Nucleic acid binder design. Structure first.
Ligand SMILES: [K+]
Ligand SMILES: [K+]
Ligand SMILES: [K+]
Ligand SMILES: [K+]
Ligand SMILES: [K+]
Ligand SMILES: [K+]
Ligand SMILES: [K+]
Ligand SMILES: [Mg+2]
Ligand SMILES: [Mg+2]
Ligand SMILES: [Mg+2]
Ligand SMILES: [Mg+2]
Ligand SMILES: [Mg+2]
Ligand SMILES: [Mg+2]
Ligand SMILES: [Mg+2]
Ligand SMILES: [Mg+2]
Ligand SMILES: [Mg+2]
Ligand SMILES: [Mg+2]
Ligand SMILES: [Mg+2]
Ligand SMILES: [Mg+2]
Ligand SMILES: [Mg+2]
Ligand SMILES: [Mg+2]
Ligand SMILES: [Mg+2]
Ligand SMILES: [Mg+2]
Ligand SMILES: [Mg+2]
Ligand SMILES: [Mg+2]
Ligand SMILES: [Mg+2]
Ligand SMILES: [Mg+2]
Ligand SMILES: [Mg+2]
Ligand SMILES: [Mg+2]
Ligand SMILES: [Mg+2]
Ligand SMILES: [Mg+2]
Ligand SMILES: [Mg+2]
Ligand SMILES: [Mg+2]
Ligand SMILES: [Mg+2]
Ligand SMILES: [Mg+2]
Lengths: 56, 48, 117, 142, 110, 103
RNA sequence: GCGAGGGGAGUGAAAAAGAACCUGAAACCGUGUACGUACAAGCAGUGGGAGCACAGCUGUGUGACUGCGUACCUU
RNA sequence: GGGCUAAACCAUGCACCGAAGCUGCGGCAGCGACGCGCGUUGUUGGGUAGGGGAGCGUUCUGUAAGCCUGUGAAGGU
């Protein structure tokens, strides 16, 4: 099965109207190190909820 | 009398037919040959 | 004497595409499609110079009818009355007066009614 | 000079109230359709709605001649295979009496967006009462 | 006035990169950098390096102040395609287009 | 006050100071032209209807300009029949300015 | 990233002449602005036409609503 | 189609709508007359195959050791 007519650039854009990405609503701030981080994830320096959970 | 002021006699230089050059010419498409048959073909026609 | 076609061919294609501005999709971008669209637009325009004279007369008649019936007479009797009264105002003007000078239009209706009586 | 054209932002529309009691359905509908379109005004313009608002009272007392009360059938299809439905005039008056006049008028109005807009100016009621006293409708003897 | 950085001939189709560029168009550069850090797309890595370069250009070459900068313009253009061959069944060959993109970021305090 | 008159096989409703575009007249620019066949004169509530012409009614006008109108393209095309023809057209006009209306 | 690529600086008459280099059309793909578009049925135009924006009543852009209207070639 | 008891059918009459038909106004061309290319006049101008007539533009040769052009050519828009 294949198209009988070439779809338009307009129809291509309409299909892609649901493809846009969503930015992260907001980042969280660690209460001890002050780092920003994804909520419920550890920070880049290894803090979570104010505690040094892992080295490096 | 200069090389750019000489003209041929009126009626002495009729332009040739040019077939197959568009609707407006009157000889476009089939070029006066009509439709199909032996006489429309390249090299077509019966002998004397 | 070899002749390259590019400069003349480009001008011809551009002349058609310029006439196709505002058309949708390939009709304003693609020569093959734009050429057909420009031809069809020309055919319609020839046809509709004739249609325009029909549609406007039809509009004037409808407005004269409404204004005549506001004054108590149908369009067909109004026109016959004006012709019996030797009034030669045409429908374009009668429709203009019907909208912009209702007092003058009433006077024309009275003239038509008198010629019919 | 060019011919006048009515302008949607300055057209004057008035309110009327009509009593359908005992009137012949189709001969009432033509007058309604005419006035909803604006064909009675010198400013009539085919692409502009210059018509009036019309309230129709007593829709369930509209009349029809001959044997139409029992023999006029209203058909419609639900879009489901085999879904052809029907109702007689009398069945329609009993269940949805405003529809009888609304259907008749809709058939005599232009088709398309403008004709649908003209139909919204028609307000049909079964009984003898309406809620549009604020619009001060004038009695219209159609 | 405004400062530009570009990554020309980047290895990604413009359609893919445009999904990321649309996230940051018009944002303050500090917010834009945060958005890109937490976007799990290869194109977010590409765009973030161009944005960082544009910010450095504005500071070093144009004496701008980072806290004032916004992403005033960002767009992705199609670069040249690299043509490759992919063998299919029954001796048939297909063309593969490896599409590239030109990424442009413009930052400015106004 | 306005008046109705015929010119160029058409009718026109005019007031003083208006400019009217007519079919070409064989009159030089700057000259005055008389329209002595007036179909109607209306000045407020006084309305004189010609039967066909108002007695003594005359419209004064000054010829303002001659010219050619916007170009119109004529296209003729018979599909599948190897026929096509095009033609251009510009119609001549004469602009006149109404200077006086007299019953 | 001791990248690719880019921004400055400099050369030059010119660097949108920077080596993927004279000119740099079209298809095709984008960013910005103006207007239209989420109750509306078909060759997508044409005739009529409101509103909005713009430049000086007019010119330009857009085109709600409405009459008419089933591409081209070949055979 | 809506709807219609006429908005159906028959008869008589008078109005009106209605086409690129006819008329009005402006313009162009073919052919023929009549006078001096011009005037006047009559008339014609839907077209496939096809016949006849008249032109546009492109490259190149002469005219041109001329003419235009860095005070901006060709090309592009
Ligand atoms: K032949
Ligand atoms: K250059
Ligand atoms: K280029
Ligand atoms: K339309
Ligand atoms: K074919
Ligand atoms: K065949
Ligand atoms: K003649
Ligand atoms: Mg098919
Ligand atoms: Mg998708
Ligand atoms: Mg032929
Ligand atoms: Mg043959
Ligand atoms: Mg053939
Ligand atoms: Mg045969
Ligand atoms: Mg052979
Ligand atoms: Mg050569
Ligand atoms: Mg061509
Ligand atoms: Mg295009
Ligand atoms: Mg274009
Ligand atoms: Mg219709
Ligand atoms: Mg094999
Ligand atoms: Mg480098
Ligand atoms: Mg050079
Ligand atoms: Mg170049
Ligand atoms: Mg391009
Ligand atoms: Mg609905
Ligand atoms: Mg809507
Ligand atoms: Mg649809
Ligand atoms: Mg239609
Ligand atoms: Mg006609
Ligand atoms: Mg005729
Ligand atoms: Mg004539
Ligand atoms: Mg004829
Ligand atoms: Mg002919
Ligand atoms: Mg030469
Ligand atoms: Mg040359």
């Amino acid at each position: 099965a294949v198209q009988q007519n070439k779809p338009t650039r307009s129809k291509r854009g309409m299909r892609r109207s649901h493809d846009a990405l969503t930015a992260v609503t907001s980042l969280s701030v660690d209460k001890t190190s002050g780092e920003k981080h994804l909520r419920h994830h550890i920070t880049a320096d290894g803090y979570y909820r104010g505690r040094k959970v892992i080295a490096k | 009398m200069r090389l750019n002021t000489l003209s041929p006699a009126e009626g002495s230089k009729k332009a040739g037919k040019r077939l197959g050059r568009g609707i407006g010419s009157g000889l476009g498409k089939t070029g006066g040959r009509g439709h199909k048959g032996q006489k429309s073909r390249s090299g077509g026609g019966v002998r004397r | 004497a070899r002749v390259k076609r590019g400069v003349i061919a480009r001008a011809r294609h551009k002349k058609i595409l310029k006439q196709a501005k505002g058309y949708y999709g390939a009709r304003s971008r693609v020569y093959r499609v734009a050429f057909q669209a420009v031809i069809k637009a020309g055919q319609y325009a020839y046809r509709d110079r004739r249609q325009r004279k029909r549609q406007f007369r039809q509009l004037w008649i409808a407005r004269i009818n409404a204004a005549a019936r506001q004054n108590g007479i149908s369009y067909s009797k109004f026109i016959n009355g004006l012709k019996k009264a030797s009034v030669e105002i045409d429908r374009k003007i009668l429709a203009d007066i019907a909208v912009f000078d209702k007092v003058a239009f009433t006077a024309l209706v009275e003239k038509a009614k008198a010629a019919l009586a | 000079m060019k011919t006048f054209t009515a302008k949607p932002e300055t057209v004057k529309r008035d309110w009327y109230v009509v009593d359908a009691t005992g009137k012949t359905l189709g001969r009432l509908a033509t007058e309604l359709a005419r006035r909803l379109r604006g064909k009675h005004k010198a400013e009539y313009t085919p692409h502009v709605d210059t018509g009036d608002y019309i309230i129709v009272l007593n829709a369930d007392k509209v009349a029809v001649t001959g044997n139409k009360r029992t023999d006029k059938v209203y058909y419609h299809h639900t879009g489901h295979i085999g879904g052809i439905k029907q109702a007689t005039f009398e069945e329609m008056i009993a269940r949805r009496p405003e529809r009888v006049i609304e259907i008749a008028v809709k058939g005599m109005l232009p088709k398309g967006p403008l004709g649908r807009a003209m139909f919204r100016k028609l307000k049909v009621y079964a009984g003898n009462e309406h809620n549009h006293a604020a619009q001060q409708p004038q009695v219209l003897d159609i | 006035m405004e400062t530009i950085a570009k990554h020309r001939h980047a290895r990604s189709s413009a359609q893919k990169v445009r999904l990321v560029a649309d996230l940051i168009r018009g944002k303050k550069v500090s917010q834009a950098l945060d958005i890109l850090t937490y976007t799990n797309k290869k194109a977010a890595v590409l765009v973030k390096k161009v944005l960082e370069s544009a910010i450095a250009n504005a500071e070093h070459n144009d004496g701008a102040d980072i806290d004032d900068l916004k992403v005033t313009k960002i767009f992705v253009d199609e670069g040249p395609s690299m043509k490759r061959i992919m063998p299919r069944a029954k001796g048939r060959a297909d063309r593969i287009l490896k599409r590239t993109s030109h990424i442009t970021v413009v930052v400015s305090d106004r | 006050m306005y008046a109705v008159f015929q010119s160029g096989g058409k009718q026109h409703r005019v007031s003083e100071g208006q400019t009217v575009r007519l079919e070409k007249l064989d009159i030089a620019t700057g000259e005055t032209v008389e329209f002595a066949e007036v179909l109607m004169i209306a000045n407020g509530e006084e309305v004189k209807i010609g039967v066909p012409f108002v007695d003594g009614g005359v419209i004064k006008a000054e010829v303002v300009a001659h010219g050619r109108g916007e170009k119109v393209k004529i296209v003729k095309f018979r599909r599948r029949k190897h026929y096509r023809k095009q033609q251009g057209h510009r119609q001549w006009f004469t602009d006149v300015k109404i200077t006086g209306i007299s019953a």
